[model samples]
Target chain A: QPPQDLAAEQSVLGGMLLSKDAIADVLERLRPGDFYRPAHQNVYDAILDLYGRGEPADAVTVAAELDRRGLLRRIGGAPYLHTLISTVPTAANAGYYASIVAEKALLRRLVEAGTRVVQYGYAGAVAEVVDRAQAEIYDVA
Target chain B: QPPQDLAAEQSVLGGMLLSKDAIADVLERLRPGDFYRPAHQNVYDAILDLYGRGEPADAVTVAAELDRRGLLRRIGGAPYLHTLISTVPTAANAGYYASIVAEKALLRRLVEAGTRVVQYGYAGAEVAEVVDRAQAEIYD
Candidate 1:
């Protein structure tokens, strides 16, 4: 609502990008080990919901809503996110941070021999789009 | 000579991304079937050369130098490149344009009937680095 407060989204996404611990936290949450569990699925579903809204999804709102839904603590919590934001060198750098984390995730899966590349055709299908998305971001001057 | 023009590189890369004909041109150069022999290897080498030199490479200057050395025309001549650039909406949009070309190329290779996916082992090393280079460029 209210145009999804882009500034707020920027803040949260920036935090997620800059925080290595937070990204590691998110990666851990999405790991294969967590996929089958109901609680994990719910958390994953919520994150996917936000991302599905499109690039630059409002991380702050997503975090708040997820927190309200009782999912944040189980995943990591606000402090973890805050630590992430603190690592970013500047405000305009959030998009790059998000790109870095995403590339890291995708590369990890691609490199893992046991990982099934095609079973996740939907995920692979979006790679070109996502790559296009990151390529569009500019480094802060 | 001048600091490699990031803006110009973005323009050329953007053109490659936006124009299907440009991508087809580049790909065809890489894997030519008949008539003209594919210059795919040369093009791949050029892509890597730019990649290794990093993002600041002055694309127009480099193109001129390569042309003087008789390399540019072999790849696709100045007019071909100019046509490619005309397809892009603007230089600002280059990263997306460059990325789509790279990703689509990888996917096409990965899904080839015989191969399971784009393999990165030493045997397919050149192709692998092409993908790796693209991966590094994911966020352009």
Candidate 2:
């Protein structure tokens, strides 16, 4: 798995901007770090920051917020922000998109944790190996 | 997100061929349909068929079995089976590879369910009904 869903991530961000009511629901589903792409993460962080301040989180407002944080260019500037809002077919599917991104994040975390357990099994003591493996699996669960 | 881990699928298949001990563990973790690629699915199906018959499931045996079933050409023939056995770094890591493939399959299923729920919502179903259906789909 590449650990990223570019279309779903874009839809979640776009839906949040297109529908003010979706911001809270989307926030309930995912965090900035849940996004696999750094640019998407930055865009999400900017939206959350703006929402926290009780500012409107429309495309224009989000673009400005990203600009103020010197991240607009890094995230492809104003045109990209416009594209996000325009491409979203509906904000009602925000929750669906959010869930998809969250699921991918969870799977990525599982793979990472599994890799650590494998490493420990190769180098650690016999008793400690099972303990570490169990701990990692428990964390994933 | 559409989660498809092709590399993990290949690793799991390769590990099974490299070590007979790994077959049971891989079988426990995944099924033929769990494979995203059709060729991989066919290969896994052939392996399972061989295992069911109490046959060895090494590269040669699996290749010949697939051939007998008329599936060798669809899965890239004997060369692909040889590649699977040769490419495996270690069968000891089979369980780890199986886990990755299993997790990816779960994620893919979740996305599919999510898409269906979204479609239900778009079709103007009652909120409570849609919610119930979404929950059921997720649990399924």
Candidate 3:
């Protein structure tokens, strides 16, 4: 399996739900696809919608966003939205949690990119493969 | 305070000492900078030198290479090489150990790059520029 941190992803989104301040810090670090779970991706996406629209992003509003987008049931409905709100211990730590999520995503990316480098290695037609692999590794944040 | 794994570093170099096959595998995944220790880097460098010149790279030969460079004592002399040799359970697993070392390096790289991204955001930098550079830093 690739590296992942489910709890960190939850805490990041959950903390964002609790603090508008955290939303900005997190936006600096992550996007929706940075999340590992499918539903998590949507929850984060919905929250982004709320943030962008200048609306408050609490459970109800986020769930409302999801509801309007017809994704509420897909993310376990309104209750799950509430679950995210309760999941945050302190929204102040959201930036840190976002880093953890981003870091794991970085690690997973290394595995996939490394796998591709391995593939390119076997082709033997490109002197550029080694250069590309080094470029890939250095690119990891 | 960034990510590191000394045992993994030792195991990789150790396994490389035990098998030239492991050396080839390790070289594909790592450079000397991937090692956390300075001594480990020199050891890897010495081994590579030996490999490049068609010298067999057991402890004795690797140590002699180190000695020729007049830095054998810098890596704790011949004994350290022996320690590396014995530390390996199997030379076959060097590639996996190399992967662990590389992974930790990637994580460390993320910590640094993430810090830069946070700094850029706090400085009122362009989000598109910040995100693009940071994303390329990690996802390339």
Q: What would the DockQ be for model 3? A: 0.01
Q: Rate the local accuracy (lDDT) of all candidates.
A: 0.41, 0.80, 0.81
Against the true structure, whose lDDT is highest? 3
Candidate 2 ranges beyond 4 A from true positions: A1-141, B125-129
Per-prediction interface RMSD in Å: 13.5, 19.0, 21.1
In candidate 1, position A70 carries an lDDT of 65
Per residue, candidate 2 scores C-alpha lDDT tens digits across B1-140 of: 25665556777798888777888888888888788888989898888888889998888888888888899899998888877776544576677667667776787898899898888788664377778887898899
Report the C-alpha lDDT of model 3 over B22-134, residue by residue, as the tens digit. 99999999988877788999999999988999999989888888999987999999888888877654577687678768877877778877887677777654367766776
Compared with the true structure, what per-residue lDDT tens digits does model 1 show for residues B69-114?
5788785765544554553334433443333334434444444422
lDDT for predicted candidate 3 compared with the true structure: 0.81
Please give the range of 10 consecutive residues that has the lowest summed lDDT in model 3 chain B: B123-132
Instruction: Please provide, for model 3 over A1-141, each residue's C-alpha lDDT reduced to its tens digit, 9 standing for 90 to 100.
Output: 688998888888889887889999999999556888889999889888878977666664566567557787798876686677677777989999899999999898888788877887887676587898778788674
**Which residue pairs does candidate 2 place in steric collision?**
none
Docking class of 2: incorrect
